[PDB]
Amino acid sequence: KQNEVELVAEKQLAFPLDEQTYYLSKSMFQFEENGKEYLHFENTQKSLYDIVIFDIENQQIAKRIPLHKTGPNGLPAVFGSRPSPDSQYILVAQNNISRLSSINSQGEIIRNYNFQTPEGRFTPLSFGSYYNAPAFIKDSCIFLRQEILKPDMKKEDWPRTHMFASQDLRTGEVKWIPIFYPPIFKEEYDNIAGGYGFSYDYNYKESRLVCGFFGYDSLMVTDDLKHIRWYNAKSRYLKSMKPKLGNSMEGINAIIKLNENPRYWHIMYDKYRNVYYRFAEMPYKLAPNESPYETPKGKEFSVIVLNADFEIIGETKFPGKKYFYKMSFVGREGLYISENNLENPQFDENKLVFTCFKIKNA
């Protein structure tokens, strides 16, 4: 049934920092290397520009991978980076210059790739964790989310718009993947402010892609990058929903509504326990002193647990002003959720803190 399990806090991980490492990363991923687990932590916020690898067992920094802006190993515009599958070969996204790059553990460039649409158009290049969007590698190609190719989408355009593209890491060839946006977007605005986002994860055990549109009750699953199945993944605390696109002409109001309204966020596969976690944001109303552009520190959330057959087996609600759930990862011991919320009474900008949540019978 839907109430067999719950998530329960067990231990904490705490990494002491200094001025060389900022506590926030938008591209942090757990990985295994040499028999141990680590956190790949892209450290490109503010004036910083490198990658830090954290040692989970020893709760400390393991190494620092330099990133240079110029020179023979110059990476002008890193935003997003991933262990591929470990720190010896890392892929980095450079959206602003239409480039994907591979680097080694010393930050040296292996190869630069131009990444544009087949017809030579700019297309957003990203992967990261701020919403779970890890990319994935199949048959030596990297697969990435793709955004819409024209600002004024009609109903008919969604099922003709690709959700993913891949780039061959030998040849650089980009291919559109025949997985299309679902026909669940009704508004026809001249310019869309948001509302069609999704999170995804890739289950290498079953060669299985799972996508969760922020505005939709159901998860989309495919095992052959073509044929789609849908599974209910609705929070018991939220009214059933379908996406609501924002209208750019509404101005800041469109952004505020998306920020504050209930919606889903990460979908995350747990490779150790063979379960999925879907995060859900509870309803909120943005207060005057709060920024329209970021999730409020007080927004409540839940995590839905689904088993390997995509059956909901439990859901646990979390308070606001405590967690920074946009820094979450699955480790050997469980689901780790950061406590680096500015309104947490224990917040310390020089300590990266996570709580480990284990699955217990309810």
**Binding interface with Na ion (CB under 5 A):** 17-18, 21, 49-50, 67
Distance, in Å, from the CA atom of 66 to the CA atom of 180, rounded to the nearest integer, reads 38
User: CB of 50: closest distance to Na ion in angstroms?
Assistant: 5
Positive or negative: CA dihedral 77, 89, 70, 175 = negative
- Reading the block at residue 9, the tokens are 């806090």
Nearer CB in complex with Na ion: 40/234: 40
User: CB of 220: closest distance to Na ion in angstroms?
Assistant: 38
User: CB of 102: closest distance to Na ion in angstroms?
Assistant: 17
Ordered strands of the 208-213 beta sheet:
198-203, 208-213, 218-222, 229-232
User: CB of 231: closest distance to Na ion in angstroms?
Assistant: 40
Distance, in Å, from the CA atom of 315 to the CA atom of 5, rounded to the nearest integer, reads 7
User: CB of 349: closest distance to Na ion in angstroms?
Assistant: 6
**Strands of 241-311, DSSP E:** 246-247, 263-270, 275-281, 301-306
Distance, in Å, from the CA atom of 288 to the CA atom of 327, rounded to the nearest integer, reads 26
User: CB of 347: closest distance to Na ion in angstroms?
Assistant: 13
Say which DSSP state 34 is in.
T
Distance, in Å, from the CA atom of 361 to the CA atom of 182, rounded to the nearest integer, reads 35
The answer to whether the beta carbons of residues 180 and 161 sit under 8 Å apart is yes
User: CB of 40: closest distance to Na ion in angstroms?
Assistant: 16
Integer-rounded Cα Rg, in Å, for the chain is 20
Nearer CB in complex with Na ion: 21/98: 21
User: CB of 31: closest distance to Na ion in angstroms?
Assistant: 21
Nearer CB in complex with Na ion: 49/284: 49
- Reading the block at residue 141, the tokens are 């190609």
Nearer CB in complex with Na ion: 101/203: 101
Nearer CB in complex with Na ion: 18/309: 18
Nearer CB in complex with Na ion: 49/79: 49
Nearer CB in complex with Na ion: 15/216: 15
Distance, in Å, from the CA atom of 51 to the CA atom of 67, rounded to the nearest integer, reads 7
Output the residue with the shortest Cβ distance to Na ion. 49
**SS3 (DSSP) at 166:** strand
**Strands of 288-333, DSSP E:** 301-306, 312-318, 324-331
List CB contacts of 19: < 8 A, sequence separation 6 or more: none
Say which DSSP state 344 is in.
S
Nearer CB in complex with Na ion: 61/148: 61
